[PDB]
Design a protein around this ligand. Sequence first.
Ligand SMILES: [Zn+2]
Ligand SMILES: [Zn+2]
Ligand SMILES: [Zn+2]
Length: 126
Amino acid sequence: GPLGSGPSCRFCKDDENKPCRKCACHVCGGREAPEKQLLCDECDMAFHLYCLKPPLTSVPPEPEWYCPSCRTDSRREVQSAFPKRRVRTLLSVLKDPIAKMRRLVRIEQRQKRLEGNEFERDSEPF
Ligand SMILES: [Zn+2]
Ligand SMILES: [Zn+2]
Ligand SMILES: [Zn+2]
């Protein structure tokens, strides 16, 4: 059967007016509540509080959060005992048109340049 076409994003290229796994929820590939999704700290990808995890329905109080694969893949060894900040969320990013476009262009370029690195990987783009 035929494939979809339209104005294309640069990490999923499906449609800029539609939700994706990297534009919206990485776990359902959609958007419904843009005020109940978490962001990784390595990928900055969205994750519904009710798609990403079965137990809790609310965002943690801690200083950093990465996707459940990244958090299992030894990126940090332990939970934090000091509240330096709270984790990143769409209720913060998606609730601002600049934080939206910054996470969608600025972050997408951060990872997409690393996927085809022109120099050593410690290039400090952020
Ligand atoms: Zn996309
Ligand atoms: Zn979802
Ligand atoms: Zn991640």
